[PDB]
């Protein structure tokens, strides 16, 4: 699943980055 | 500069769709044409092989 290997990296990175942003956006107060 | 990155995504995504299609379609066309062709070659060879086996039996009787 080559399509997945890369889509997997894309989504894990994009969600982790988006989540890191979600957490910081609130956590910064 | 960021337009380079946009151009890269434009070519990569135009290529991705061209590729999802080409990757799959080039194989489905070549591969299904190949098995269809060679399914027939396989059947024709099997028919000829049976015919030759019959021909050999007939010569043995001759």
């Amino acid at each position: 699943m080559d399509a997945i290997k890369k889509k997997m990296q894309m989504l894990k990175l994009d969600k982790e980055n988006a989540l890191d942003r979600a957490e910081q956006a609130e956590a910064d107060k | 500069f960021d337009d380079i990155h946009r151009k890269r995504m434009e070519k990569d995504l135009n290529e991705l769709q061209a590729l999802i299609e080409a990757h799959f379609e080039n194989r489905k066309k070549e591969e299904e044409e190949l098995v269809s062709l060679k399914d027939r070659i396989e059947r024709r060879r099997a028919e000829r092989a049976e015919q030759q086996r019959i021909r050999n039996e007939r010569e043995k009787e001759r």
Binding site: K5, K6, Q9, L13, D20 | -
Partner: protein
């Protein structure tokens, strides 16, 4: 084939040698760091046969060869064999004779000076390279990954180095060099597969076990729980096809071997594992450094490609680290292949042209010059 005097770049480990040219973003060929020699008396006449085989030749003809590795724990102990490897590596496959092109070779930050001196001497006196540089592997990993800051774990076959770098500066007091590596993980697997009824004692057998490890093994996010089920049921077993058509079925040994990275006591090593090695480097750096190193655990070298390692290393550091702090691992798919790529990046930087030792300065000073010029 080349239209410019681009440097040639190689990352020579105790395992494999990655090679290509400066300015690319990938190696063009990989060779094992192996020179093979026949252990049998020839009976037939006129069948050719070399005194020694190199790289992929050594593995292809291995059925009757003993296979030796010229590099151990990060250094060259046998340079006659490395010269054959370099001729093959630079000229037979990349098609470039070093005589007309600069060469970049790599080392760990505390790698014995004798090794950088021989790497420099060999390329200048045997290959007549116009220039040399010996690079730090940690620098190269950070360039390739897009970082100037992080802890570089080069966790390959030879030695785990573990060096913190911040804003491009070395923080040497916080280096936790450890004699725990991929070669030891393989040796452990040979012993536990022996317990299962599959003894491996010869070169062919050793190479099979290294192939089993590379295709079947993983670290697991949670070892003890993974082992509890793998050691109790066939549902976590995986088979491997041996070269003669026979098969081997492996259970918890599949992850117990890689686990030695986190539990070094499995091979008699006095260590708490690679995650405390990493953690201590962060811990020993200044307090306004630590935050950036916690956020940048950099993965390079072999073993970084075991399943569960990227997630496991971030979890293990998080478990040692203070709360509030964000612990992050830098572990993209291009992970570990970062050291070769960095060699290419460094060799081709405009800011690094003055760092090349020319074959002018070299002959006036001799090979000890690398210790004065490379860093």
């Amino acid at each position: 084939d080349e239209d410019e005097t681009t440097a040639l770049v190689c990352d020579n480990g105790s395992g494999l040698v990655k090679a290509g040219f400066a300015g690319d973003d990938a190696p063009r060929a990989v060779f094992p760091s192996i020179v093979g020699r026949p252990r049998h008396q020839g009976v037939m006449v006129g069948m050719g046969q070399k005194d020694s085989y190199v790289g992929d030749e050594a593995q292809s003809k291995r059925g009757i060869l003993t296979l030796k590795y010229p590099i151990e724990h990060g250094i060259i102990t046998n340079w006659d064999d490395m010269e054959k490897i370099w001729h093959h590596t630079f000229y037979n496959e990349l098609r470039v004779a070093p005589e007309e092109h600069p060469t970049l070779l790599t080392e760990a930050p505390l790698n014995p000076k004798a090794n950088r001196e021989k790497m420099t001497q060999i390329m200048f006196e045997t290959f007549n390279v116009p220039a040399m540089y010996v690079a730090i592997q940690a620098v190269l990993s950070l360039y390739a990954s897009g970082r100037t800051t992080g802890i570089v774990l080069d966790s390959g076959d030879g030695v785990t180095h573990n060096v913190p770098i911040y804003e491009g500066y070395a923080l040497p007091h916080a280096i936790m060099r450890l004699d725990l590596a991929g070669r030891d993980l393989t040796d452990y697997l040979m012993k536990i597969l022996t317990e299962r009824g599959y003894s491996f004692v010869t070169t062919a057998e050793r190479e099979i076990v290294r192939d089993i490890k590379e295709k079947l093994c993983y670290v697991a996010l949670d070892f003890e729980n993974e082992m509890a089920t793998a050691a109790s049921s066939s549902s976590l077993e995986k088979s491997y096809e041996l070269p003669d058509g026979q098969v081997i079925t492996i259970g918890n040994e599949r992850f117990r071997c890689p686990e030695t990275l986190f539990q070094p006591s499995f091979i008699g090593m006095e260590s708490a594992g690679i995650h405390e090695t990493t953690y201590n480097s962060i811990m020993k750096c200044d307090i306004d450094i630590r935050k950036d190193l916690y956020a940048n655990n950099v993965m390079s070298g072999g073993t970084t490609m075991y399943p569960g390692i990227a997630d496991r290393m971030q979890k293990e550091i998080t478990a040692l680290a203070p709360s509030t702090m964000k612990i992050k691992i830098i572990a993209p798919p291009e992970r570990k292949y970062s050291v070769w790529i960095g060699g290419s990046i460094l060799a081709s930087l405009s800011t690094f042209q003055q760092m090349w030792i020319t074959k002018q300065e070299y002959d006036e000073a001799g090979p000890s010059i690398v210790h004065r010029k490379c860093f």
